Design a protein around this ligand. Structure first.
Ligand SMILES: Nc1ncnc2c1ncn2[C@@H]1O[C@H](COP(=O)(O)OP(=O)(O)OP(=O)(O)O)[C@@H](O)[C@H]1O
Ligand SMILES: Nc1ncnc2c1ncn2[C@@H]1O[C@H](COP(=O)(O)OP(=O)(O)OP(=O)(O)O)[C@@H](O)[C@H]1O
Ligand SMILES: C[C@@H]1C[C@H]2[C@@H]3CCC4=CC(=O)C=C[C@]4(C)[C@@]3(F)[C@@H](O)C[C@]2(C)[C@@]1(O)C(=O)CO
Ligand SMILES: [Mg+2]
Ligand SMILES: [Mg+2]
Lengths: 627, 255, 133, 627
């Protein structure tokens, strides 16, 4: 056979068009591209000066200037960086995918501490997103000053410059399109720089005509500090960084600074604010506050993948030297990366909270603002429930006004306790004075008060703590450590009241699953408890009010109500006597219903048709008044 | 105002839905007889199946299946579901040697003398023993029970087949969650998966044997074994489908 | 001579290194228990390339191989110890300017977390693996 | 002066590497791209054959075949389209960013009805995301069969082929990399084709070996129908399309098919399902089931930009001939476009709902499943709020079991009603039998019953309907269409009960704002209403249960309670007499508290410390029983 061999070619005209029209979605990024090129130019000269100081004889100040001109629609960017020789000017701005920066880095001897941005070779051309024409003036230490010019028409020109000498450096002039003039506004420039390029090692100064004189404002006043060794940073320094980062006035509450080494590497700063913002979980569109940077240029922010929602109050920065960025440099090619970053960020946040917890006063401040986030995390994060649970604090029947940990509870358990007891409800007082704890209190058993709606979702996922199960005192089957004599007496009581249990069930019909004799009450005649599984009275009332709910399921899902009788109450005993004397006594029937409704309310259930209930009360009043 | 949501897990919804234990209503003064016992159980079974229907209808996503498919799935698997319910009750009160059909109807080896209980109970007991061996949790139980409902389909497919499969996947994931929360090495979570999964597949065998027996007592009117009408109707309709191989058994493990 | 640029990544059993020399000539790859040496002439200018890599952890040179294509030279090294973590390719921690991670083929393989178990394809693999328990 | 002019260059090696390593984030798209190329090839031959039928003498079928081969570890795509000449293999595959498809289109006479997919000239090289060598065999009607081959090493070769003739067509053979074998699986191929290319106009057949034959399965069996004139599509045709698209076992409830012409053009199909999906609200990952296609190729889904959240139950397709896409063809450039599309989709959805509402009982079916979505839309969408309000249906005191519109309410209003009366609450009966509507019922006034938690949000935006304001019957003061004689009587009553009111106020210090005489009760003794601002009793009940809520505002929006007295109630008259006779009579203090607490149960409030209430009752019981 005969086989012909060809080299690959490219069509320059279409290539230029694609760069301009299909690579970038946000026109303003052209400014960060030009700034990034400038910081590289400055690093190159700085690097060379390390071994040959004469390199800076042409000028020692390394900085970036931005000079808009509304009188002639241009924007000029000025560097004092290394510049380009005629040959470099032609090869690098002249060639679509040539990167001088990349070549430089490859040429460098390891371990030079240099990190530059610019491996693609395409980016200068983003200037044409807003510019009609671009003019570049350059002076290199080894050559004459030259001017490059192009409208991206497939050609460009080079001539020897005749203007003022720059000493060393570059000047890039964008001749702007008439319909892209907001870029000449002081406000707009500041917004762009602040968002994308504020963490640049060289100062950036904006030159603005005002009434005349030209003002000179440095924009990048805050240094990245996450690049410093953590042990050399004081709290005051972290605080100032934090404030300028978050536009707070208040200081930070807590901070971690750490790094991850390995095939995938990064550094990060995580801050806990002193007050929860006021929009958590309501904003809905804004999800986390962790910004991701590569070789300190901003890449992305509102990324759901970096942090689980329960940690959406952490403010912070993640910075990596090497990530697989997209051609636009606005995203990553490998989403699998985010998963790893997330595993590590979560792990460290939990360490911070654990450490914070050792400072009792600061922990109290923290918990008061973010306890909902912890509880949410327990509900959703199955991996860390074990650790999150140790951060919980609750009021208990024995804590007065302090909130205590589950471990603290455990240290006070009696030898015969096998369970951790708790009650859920609407308020601290409704639960504290509840009938459901009358015996537990009598016996000196401590009960945990859980009074936030979120507690219903949280406790459901806890089940056990350090081997002790959790027991709701509003459920059937509550067991207390008990004496033999008492157990025998309870059996006798169950037997003698069997007849009311039957009669009352017959009267109540479907209003109750069963009627039993109580072992948890002391002074209240009765109460209503729910079945072991599933919903309790509080879960039920909560589910009924979530608004965006399936109404068709509420016809199946309801708490199963059991009525318990206090065998030693005087109402119950006279009731037993009457009920046995006449099973159809109207008086009995009315009393049973009244007790049921009363118990139902005190037990936390909404009362269906409260008007009927009220009418019974009104009749009692009328009787008392002789009406 | 805004409306942020927080939802319960499927497992907790299943905990709510799950029906109560029914009493047999057996008069304990009545002496044992093989047919008296089986009749009592058939009448109970009737009530349990009725409840099973109500139960299935409450399962999230089930209701959106073509109605005809819902009925099909219930009939195809009703025996599997009952075997699990029995398993659970015996396991939880184990007593490895007793079957807990109902409170009151607790059957020991010396009561389990019916020729079928002297034979077929080996399978009923098997399920209890396996739940025991693996120390199955309640949440795992509920997840598995739900999957049994979805284990048998017509060989010709369901009218709402795509949805059926989506639902099946939902419950599979829930199982896994119930396993994972037990903690331990990831390989242990996978072993446990594997083992529970094997248990589910093995119930096809259990059911097959029980049904063969059922059909025989159902049809053989020689014995005084009565059935509630509902089961009799179900049994009648399933015998000819069963016997023709028109029912496809789904397995997790092929072998 | 200059080093060729290269990318790397790994898996439980193997370490992969790709030397990015297009239109290579005279490719010589030396696999030693603790060291990898690459030597290549190539590209349009016949530039001489040399890469001496002092490895992080030992390999089995008798289960190592390479394949030359017109686009690149791929070397596959067998890890001396299966499951060994390789946070870096080399013994020393200095950054090498010419070496980077091949993120497009990077995998967090040392991750057996309880992701959704099914994931039927992942699942099936795991059931086949548990089938060997 | 002397100015040199230069042309732009490449750096083909780097360009090739960017295309392969930086442009595409996924890999599955290599199939997407190769299929799209075949589609263009097929359209080109089809088009030419329209004027010269001999062009199809070489073959009449126009189709695409996919043939994986696991022994060779290759994947072959076979086309029957126009093919390439030697010159084209070299110019089109050997030149980056050259596009034959684009040139073809430019050379066409408008308005030829051909619309091809392809402009950029780089998609072919996505093949190297999974290959290894790529071999292309072509046969064009005007040339010999040739084989092109490359491994993207900077060059490629061309040789005359020697193997089996193809007649006419293109064969692309991808050798696969060792670890890319997943793309040879039947399952994986089907998933990819369905996701991206199911609406390609030519049939695609997948050839898979099975136990010992090749199974030939067509994948793209469903035609896009949105391209057809709406008047030619029967409901049955929409039905089948719909079911194929959604996998429903039943037809859609309603469909709207429309197009938009202008500087932005598109066509779309929007379907309303017969059943709300379970997890409609609860699935937080999948929202907005509207897919966006460009020139029948899938671009994106699950985008928050296309339609409001409250319309997320609508299934559908938007297909646009000329949107400006990103180089990856995964996202749209100029995202502002999506706002226009959104504006149009919403108004057309509302148009559809209105049409359904105008005359069908099917509207009841719709509403039963989606009333929540309408109400939510009222809460959030202010621009369409008026339209949305007419889609609401409510039960009223005069509708029996029908739900009626606000227009129907208006139709039946009395000539003296200047207001629309409504009540909110927990259940239909709890509301219907409420004390708050006793007098309104007496006068024959209709009251709207709102019993879903979502309603409480809806009413905060609805202030009036057709100029008639909405008034809650549970608020501080009602205007009733009273007679003049009635008004003076009300004044007389206020006067005689003034002393009682001040007495009760002191007894109830800080439990009420004031005690006043009622003009809304008939048979019930007192009840509790709230201040004009802020929350109603029902709103408070709901807000307390939202879990992810800020508790600090509970003492702010709580609103205040007012107790209203029925001057004609026998309890109240007895009370007035006693209270005036002795202000400090203990029995008065006790009666007043009991009435207060009872009033809170009839009105929708929880009691604080409900145990006290229960105890008051237990004492009344004990007295009745002689204990
Ligand atoms: N202000 C400058 N001073 C000196 N050299 C420059 C300057 N701007 C650009 N260059 C040269 O032009 C080349 C091309 O830069 P360009 O911004 O187009 O690509 P890049 O930075 O290499 O790629 P990327 O798109 O990844 O940023 C650089 O590699 C550099 O050699
Ligand atoms: N199967 C084929 N049959 C005939 N010609 C083809 C085939 N595949 C590719 N070509 C030719 O090669 C050219 C390059 O195609 P490629 O897919 O790279 O780019 P494109 O489709 O023009 O661009 P895009 O990235 O926008 O899809 C086409 O314009 C076409 O002329
Ligand atoms: C061996 C079979 C299997 C039996 C059943 C197994 C499952 C089951 C569990 C219960 O908790 C109550 C009843 C049932 C549903 C059942 F116990 C009875 O119905 C009788 C039954 C069909 C059977 O005993 C007969 O065939 C009797 O004719
Ligand atoms: Mg650059
Ligand atoms: Mg193409």
């Amino acid at each position: 056979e005969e086989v012909e061999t060809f080299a690959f070619q490219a069509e320059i005209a279409q290539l230029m068009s694609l760069i301009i029209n299909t690579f970038y979605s946000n026109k303003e990024i052209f400014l960060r591209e030009l700034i990034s090129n400038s910081s590289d130019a400055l690093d190159k000269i700085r690097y060379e000066s390390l071994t040959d100081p004469s390199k800076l004889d042409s000028g020692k100040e390394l900085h970036i200037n931005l000079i808009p001109n509304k009188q002639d629609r241009t924007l000029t960017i000025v560097d004092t960086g290394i510049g380009m020789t005629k040959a470099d000017l032609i090869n690098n701005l002249g060639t679509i995918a040539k990167s001088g920066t990349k070549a430089f880095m490859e040429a460098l001897q390891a371990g030079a501490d240099i990190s530059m941005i610019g491996q693609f070779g395409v980016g200068f051309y983003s200037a044409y997103l807003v510019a009609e024409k671009v003019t570049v003036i350059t002076k290199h230490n080894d050559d004459e000053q030259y001017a490059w010019e192009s409208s991206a028409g497939g050609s460009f020109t080079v001539r020897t410059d005749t203007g003022e000498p720059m000493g060393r450096g570059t000047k890039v002039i964008l001749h702007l399109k008439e319909d892209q003039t907001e870029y000449l506004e002081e406000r707009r420039i500041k917004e762009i720089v602040k968002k994308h390029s504020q963490f640049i090692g060289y100062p950036i100064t904006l030159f603005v005509e005002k009434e005349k004189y030209i003002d000179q404002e440095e924009l990048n006043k805050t240094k990245p500090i996450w690049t410093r060794n953590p042990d050399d940073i004081t709290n005051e320094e972290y605080g100032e960084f934090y404030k300028s980062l978050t536009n707070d006035w208040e200081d930070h509450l807590a901070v971690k600074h750490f790094s991850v080494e390995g095939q995938l590497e990064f550094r990060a700063l995580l801050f806990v604010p002193r007050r929860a913002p006021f929009d958590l979980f309501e904003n809905r569109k804004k999800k986390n506050n962790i910004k991701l940077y590569v070789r300190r240029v901003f890449i992305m922010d509102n990324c759901e993948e970096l942090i689980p929602e329960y940690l959406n109050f952490i403010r912070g920065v993640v910075d990596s030297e090497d990530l697989p960025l997209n051609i636009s440099r606005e995203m990553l090619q490998q989403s699998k990366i985010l998963k790893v970053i997330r595993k590590n960020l979560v792990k460290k946040c939990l360490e911070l909270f654990t450490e914070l917890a050792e400072d009792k006063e600061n922990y109290k401040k923290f918990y008061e603002q973010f306890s909902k986030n912890i509880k949410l995390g327990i509900h959703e994060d199955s991996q860390n429930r074990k650790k999150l649970s140790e951060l919980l604090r609750y009021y208990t029947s024995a804590s007065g006004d302090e909130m205590v940990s589950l471990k603290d509870y455990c240290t006070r358990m009696k030898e015969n306790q096998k369970h951790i007891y708790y009650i859920t409800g609407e308020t601290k007082d409704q639960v504290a004075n509840s009938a459901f704890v009358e015996r537990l209190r009598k016996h000196g058993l401590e009960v945990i008060y859980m009074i936030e709606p979120i507690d219903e979702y949280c406790v459901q996922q806890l089940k056990e703590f350090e081997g002790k199960t959790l027991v709701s005192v509003t459920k059937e089957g509550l067991e207390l450590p008990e004496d033999e004599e008492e157990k025998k007496k309870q059996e006798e009581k169950k037997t003698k009241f069997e007849n009311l249990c039957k009669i009352m069930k017959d009267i109540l019909e479907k209003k109750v699953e069963k009627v039993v004799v109580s072992n948890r009450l002391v002074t209240s005649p009765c109460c209503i408890v729910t079945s072991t599984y599933g919903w309790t009275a509080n879960m039920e009332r909560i589910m009924k009010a979530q608004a965006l709910r399936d109404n068709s399921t509420m016809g199946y899902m309801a708490a199963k109500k059991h009525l318990e009788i206090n065998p030693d109450h005087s109402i119950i005993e006279t009731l037993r006597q009457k009920a046995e004397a006449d099973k159809n006594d109207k008086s009995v029937k009315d009393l049973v219903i009244l007790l049921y409704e009363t118990a139902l309310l005190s037990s936390g259930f909404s009362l269906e048709d409260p008007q009927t209930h009220a009418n019974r009360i009104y009749r009692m009043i009328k009787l008392g008044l002789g009406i | 105002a805004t409306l942020p949501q927080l939802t319960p897990t499927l497992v907790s919804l299943l905990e709510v839905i799950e029906p109560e234990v029914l009493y047999a209503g057996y008069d304990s003064s009545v002496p044992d007889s093989t047919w008296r016992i089986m009749t009592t159980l058939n009448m109970l079974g009737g009530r349990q199946v009725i409840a099973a229907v109500k139960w299935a209808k409450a399962i999230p996503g089930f209701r959106n299946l073509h109605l005809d498919d819902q009925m099909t799935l219930l009939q195809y698997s009703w025996m599997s579901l009952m075997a699990f319910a029995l398993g659970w009750r015996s396991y939880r009160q184990s007593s490895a040697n007793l079957l807990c059909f109902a409170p009151d109807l607790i059957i020991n080896e010396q009561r389990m003398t019916l020729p079928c209980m002297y034979d077929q109970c080996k399978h009923m007991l098997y399920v209890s023993s396996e739940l025991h061996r693996l120390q199955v949790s309640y949440e795992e139980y509920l997840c598995m029970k739900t999957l049994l409902l979805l284990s048998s389909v017509p060989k010709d497919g369901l009218k709402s087949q795509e949805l059926f499969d989506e639902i099946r996947m939902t419950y599979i994931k829930e199982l896994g969650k119930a396993i994972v929360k037990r903690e331990g090495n990831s390989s242990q979570n996978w072993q446990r998966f594997y083992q529970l999964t094997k248990l589910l597949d093995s119930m096809h065998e259990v059911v097959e044997n029980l049904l063969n027996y059922c059909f025989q007592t159902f049809l053989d009117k020689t014995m005084s074994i009565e059935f509630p009408e509902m089961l009799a109707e179900i049994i009648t309709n399933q015998i000819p489908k069963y016997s023709n191989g028109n029912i496809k058994k789904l397995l997790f493990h092929q072998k | 001579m200059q080093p060729a640029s290269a990318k790397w990544y790994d898996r439980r059993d193997y370490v992969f290194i790709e030397f990015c020399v297009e239109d290579s000539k005279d490719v010589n790859v030396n696999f030693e228990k603790s060291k990898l040496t690459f030597s290549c002439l190539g590209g349009s200018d016949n530039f001489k390339h040399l890469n001496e890599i002092d490895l992080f952890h030992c390999i089995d040179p008798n289960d190592s191989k390479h394949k030359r294509t017109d686009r690149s030279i791929l070397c596959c090294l067998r890890k001396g110890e299966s499951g060994q973590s390789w946070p870096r390719l080399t013994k020393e921690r200095a950054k090498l300017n010419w070496l980077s991670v091949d993120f497009n083929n990077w995998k967090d393989w040392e991750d057996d977390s309880d992701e959704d178990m099914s994931n039927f394809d992942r699942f099936s693999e795991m059931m086949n693996n548990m089938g060997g328990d």
